Amino acid sequence: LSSNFGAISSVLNDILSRLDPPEAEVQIDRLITGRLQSLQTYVTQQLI
Amino acid sequence: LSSNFGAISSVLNDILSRLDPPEAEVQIDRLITGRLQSLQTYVTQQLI
Amino acid sequence: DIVMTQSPSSLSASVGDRVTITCQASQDINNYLNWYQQKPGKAPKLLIYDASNLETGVPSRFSGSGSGTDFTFTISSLQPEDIATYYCQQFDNLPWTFGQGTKVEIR
Amino acid sequence: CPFGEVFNATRFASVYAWNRKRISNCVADYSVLYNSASFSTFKCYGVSPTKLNDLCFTNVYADSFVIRGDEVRQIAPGQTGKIADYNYKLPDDFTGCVIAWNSNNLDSKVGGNYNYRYRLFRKSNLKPFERDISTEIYQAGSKPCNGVEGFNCYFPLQSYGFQPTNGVGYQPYRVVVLSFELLHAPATVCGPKKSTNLVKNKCVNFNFNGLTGTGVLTESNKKFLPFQQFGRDIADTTDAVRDPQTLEILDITPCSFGGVSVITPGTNTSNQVAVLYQGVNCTEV
Amino acid sequence: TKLNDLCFTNVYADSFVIRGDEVRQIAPGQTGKIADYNYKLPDDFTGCVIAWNSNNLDSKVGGNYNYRYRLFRKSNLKPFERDISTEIYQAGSKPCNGVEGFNCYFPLQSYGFQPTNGVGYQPYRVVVLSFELL
Amino acid sequence: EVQLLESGGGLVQPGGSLRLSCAASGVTVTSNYMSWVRQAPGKGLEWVSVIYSGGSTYYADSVKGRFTISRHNSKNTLYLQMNSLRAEDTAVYYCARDLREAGGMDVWGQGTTVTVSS
Amino acid sequence: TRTQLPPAYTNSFTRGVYYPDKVFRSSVLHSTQDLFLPFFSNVTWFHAIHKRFDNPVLPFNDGVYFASTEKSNIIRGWIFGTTLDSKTQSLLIVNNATNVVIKVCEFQFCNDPFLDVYYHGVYSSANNCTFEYVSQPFLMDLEGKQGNFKNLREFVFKNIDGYFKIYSKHTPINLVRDLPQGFSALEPLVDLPIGINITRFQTLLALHRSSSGWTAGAAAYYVGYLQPRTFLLKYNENGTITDAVDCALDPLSETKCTLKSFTVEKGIYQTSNFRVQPTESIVRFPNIL
């Protein structure tokens, strides 16, 4: 959670309220992509 | 290390000297992203 | 950068008297020096180029000499048609700083 | 807050000595102040232009000067320029915005506008919040400048020739730079926010001046330093919260202790079905 | 620093001799008297410019007038274009039958390379190194 | 045949934009160097600005943004706009073409007087 | 008659531990990269003890410590700037043990400035400035002790993106043999959100009486030097900093920094990677192509 992977902020609300949804939503999508990569890595090493 | 992974080049040195440092660090971080996905695949396959 | 100021600033003589003009620059200039005649009111006109060759219309009394930083200009016989201001400047390195100007008026 | 004393000032300063106006310890509703289209140019790239009322900041800074318009739109991350290198430089993660308005026919003076001065060259980049006040001369040629003009040497201090005659793209622009700091101190001046009290043993959402979370607000029972704003537990979670109005300390414990599962028999045998809410003390009943 | 170890397929090394002060004017994107008729660097010029004084050898007591520069051209300089036409330009209705005159100019004029010139105006031998990358 | 005329100027109020026009015939505006020079009444020369061939405009530091330059190839003419002219810029303006290092700027154009007095 | 004594130096063992931010923590072992005082470091220890008038001036590029162990409280303030004249607006911070006053104006400081007072004045007039600040009054422990030195004052000036934050720690201590020991934490006191960088500073040495009419006693003080290092911080049940450790002091400190633990048992570990530095850069060229 503390790893932003290039984000401008880590708070969930501090992303939507500042930038436009056409940009804020895509920012959130790639941040959640980073989180999903973390989850895939965690589950893969956790499942080995 | 010689594979591009969709990057401009496989030599990490050149991009630091190509774009402006405040962004050239991000175009280095895209290399880091590619090479760390490479490490993730390498270590999970190494661990299997 | 380069400021080019005329060695003479205000010279006054009568008709037929010699006029000596020194045109110096901050450092050496070459092939970038022209001798003009603006005259009061009328449009400026270049008369002498390269300080060696006489142009069509200029009387043979006018002469120029020098090879390098300093170019000298000599008028053996001043005439009423020569009431004017000579300006020689450095049109090489912008911005073009202005010189003193040699205003020759007859008495 | 002094809404009109920031943007609508009668006179503006120069880039060499730009005037700074600070906003703090008041109530600011920037929606109506932004709604008016009284600015020729107002640029924001990666930070909120409009939601200063929702997610605000502690200190507000407005640095007003006059610069070239073509470099005003060049004020963006990853961009550089003569002013961006010598006169007015910003950090890598600049938290602010730029405003520009054209004032070519009023800033001018009859005897020559020498009021605006700038540095012509500098050998290296500028530190954050640094103003070039050293008298170091820039050396271009081999012969030393001797601290004055000379061969390939110029005095760094030069005067803007701001005339009303300048073109639309190159006219002088009065520029206000809006700045702050984020994620360093509890902000004090947000928008028209009305508040309410809190309840214990009933899990709710809490939004303390941008610090958001969900949980039960139960009794705090640990000794804290007087300067604390909020505390954390071992699990890297916001564990304690203090009310900014009535200074009291309370705990946080996230709600909804579990999930949903459905116990069902075969539809060929029965249709009555039970439900488990996994891990949580029952609430709806 | 990295020019020692950077791979370029070709280096265009352009060697010539000009006046001293005009060297710094040879910059990528810079425009001037030479950038329109003799040699203009491309807008993406990635390379170097070198110039060293040669007043001792390339200056005559009577005047070394062997070096010439071209003044007129039928079109503006595009990135790395070489026009070396010796046909006299026709700027009017007067036929230019190989002789000098008004509207009949041979575009080449001699450099005034003399020892009298100052350091910033002495004849400099200048080489431009334009590196090419795909 | 070769001819250089100028248009623009008058007694407009201060802060009133204007547009000088330099109509030249017999030469090529695209591939020639040109300059603008203003002269005070009863004074010496005073250079203002330079235009090169290929779209390169430069001035002095005091007139850094003064001009907005455009050209028309229908009659090979220059148009040059100033927004909100200045009071002491009352002077006679000339558009000039210099041959540089083969005889420099022998004959001048016409020159038009512009007054922006209050 | 200005004479400078030799610059005596002292070693700082475990001084300079403070909370890196305003956020409080409990029962954690947290790492942070901040400007600190490296453990077992150099501190300049200046005296005024029995013409013999010292005028130490020190730079403020990265930040320093100010430590006072005395009862008379002779030192009362600091002067910040570059030249301390009309060229640059000079900062003046003075605390008379009741309140703190800061002024950045055209103070015509004397050639030999000091806090000389009478009727029991560093400037004659002040003008040409846009800054002034007076702190709200606070209770300093003015109760007088006798015998050995029983007071400790610690002051830190950090430069966070142009904002100069002043941290303080005032506590009663019992000095033993002129060699400082102890353990505590520094609470942030105040901030200066100006944004004007200051090059160097001078400390004020006062003259107090109950040219030849001003007398004073003896005084001395320590000054540290911050560095950009990384520490771990251990928090106890009450959440106060009970231990702090450097991440570059010795390989044991590097080990505990990497493992985020303060009780390390048997085993072979990893801290970082060793690497021979690029001693030279080798470019080559065919001999005489």
Q: Please, what is the Cα angle at E117 between E116 and E118, to 5 degrees?
A: 120
Instruction: Tell me if D72 sits within 8 A of D17, measured CB to CB.
Output: no
What are G270's two structure tokens?
């990893």
CB of B19 less than 8 A from some CB of E: no
Rounded-to-integer distance, Cα A11 and Cα A34, Å: 15
Residue G183 CA to its chain's centroid (Å): 16
Rounded-to-integer distance, Cα G123 and Cα G102, Å: 14
Rounded-to-integer distance, Cα G3 and Cα G70, Å: 23
Rounded-to-integer distance, Cα G268 and Cα G274, Å: 16
What are the residues facing G30 on neighbouring strands? G233
**Is E121 exposed, middle or buried (CB count within 10 Å of its CB: 0-12, 13-18, 19+)?**
buried
Distance from CA of D123 to the nearest CA of B (A): 18
Q: Amino acid letter at A10? A: S
Distance from CA of F85 to the nearest CA of E (A): 28
What are D69's two structure tokens?
């318009």
Instruction: Tell me if D92 sits within 8 A of B20, measured CB to CB.
Output: no
CB of F12 less than 8 A from some CB of D: no
CB of C46 less than 8 A from some CB of F: yes
The closest of B16, F66, D227 to G186, measured between CA atoms, is D227
Instruction: Tell me if E19 sits within 8 A of E120, measured CB to CB.
Output: no
Rounded-to-integer distance, Cα A29 and Cα A7, Å: 11
What are D239's two structure tokens?
């564990």
Of D91, D230, D240, the CB nearest to G161: D91
User: E42 — phi, psi (to 5°)?
Assistant: -65, 155
Identify the closest residue of chain B to A44 by CA–CA distance. B44
Q: Taking the C-alpha atoms of A38, A41, A42 and A45 in order, what is their torsion angle to the nearest 10 degrees?
A: -170
What's the full length of chain C, in residues? 107
When computed from its CA atoms, the radius of gyration of chain C, rounded to whole angstroms, is 13
Rounded-to-integer distance, Cα A20 and Cα D55, Å: 15
Whether the bond into C95 is cis, omega within 30 of 0: yes
User: How many other CB atoms are there within 10 angstroms of residue D180's CB atom?
Assistant: 19
DSSP string across G21-54: SS-EE-S-EEEEEEEE--SSEEEEEEE-------
Of A2, A11, A17, the CB nearest to D48: A17
Instruction: Tell me if C90 sits within 8 A of C32, measured CB to CB.
Output: yes
Q: Amino acid letter at D204? A: V
What are F58's two structure tokens?
């430069």
Rounded-to-integer distance, Cα C95 and Cα C93, Å: 6
To one decimal, the resolution in angstroms is 3.9
Instruction: Tell me if G235 sits within 8 A of G241, measured CB to CB.
Output: yes
User: Are residues D129 and G195, on separate chains, in Cβ contact within 8 Å?
Assistant: yes
User: E78 — phi, psi (to 5°)?
Assistant: -90, 165
Which residue has tokens 């600049």?
A: D94
Kindly provide the b/e burial profile for residues G16-38, where b requires at least 16 CB atoms within 10 angstroms of the residue's own CB. Answer: bbbbbeeebbbebbbeeeebbbb
Interface test with D, best of A18, A26, A27 (most D CBs within 10 A): A18
Identify the closest residue of chain C to E109 by CA–CA distance. C31
Rounded-to-integer distance, Cα C71 and Cα F74, Å: 45
What are D105's two structure tokens?
């026919």
What's the full length of chain B, in residues? 48
DSSP state of G198: -
Rounded-to-integer distance, Cα G203 and Cα G77, Å: 6
The closest of F109, F38, F114 to F77, measured between CA atoms, is F109
DSSP string across B1-48: ----TTSS-S-HHHHHTTS-HHHHHHHHHHHHHHHHHHHHHHHHHHH-
Rounded-to-integer distance, Cα E42 and Cα E130, Å: 9
User: F70 — phi, psi (to 5°)?
Assistant: -150, 160
Distance from CA of D161 to the nearest CA of A (A): 38
Rounded-to-integer distance, Cα G264 and Cα F5, Å: 93
What are G79's two structure tokens?
């002067």
Q: Taking the C-alpha atoms of D243, D245, D247 and D252 in order, what is their torsion angle to the nearest 10 degrees?
A: -10
The closest of D111, D87, D109 to D175, measured between CA atoms, is D87
User: Are residues E118 and C28, on separate chains, in Cβ contact within 8 Å?
Assistant: yes
DSSP string across E75-96: SPPPTT------SPP--SSS--
Of F33, F52, F102, the CB nearest to E109: F102
DSSP state of E104: B
What are the residues facing E51 on neighbouring strands? E126
Identify the closest residue of chain E to F1 by CA–CA distance. E92
The closest of G45, G16, G11 to G245, measured between CA atoms, is G16
* Strand pairing class (D60-68; D157-159): unpaired
What are F96's two structure tokens?
């000039």
User: Are residues D164 and F15, on separate chains, in Cβ contact within 8 Å?
Assistant: yes
Chains touching E by CB (3 or more pairs below 8 Å): B, C, F
Rounded-to-integer distance, Cα G113 and Cα G214, Å: 13
DSSP state of E20: S
The closest of E17, E12, E2, E1 to E126, measured between CA atoms, is E17
Rounded-to-integer distance, Cα D161 and Cα D172, Å: 10
CB of C93 less than 8 A from some CB of E: yes
Q: Amino acid letter at D131? A: R
The closest of D176, D169, D170, D164 to D66, measured between CA atoms, is D176
D and G touch per CB criterion (3+ pairs under 8 A): yes
What are the residues facing G42 on neighbouring strands? G11
Judged by DSSP in three states, C66 sits in coil
User: Are residues C101 and F107, on separate chains, in Cβ contact within 8 Å?
Assistant: no
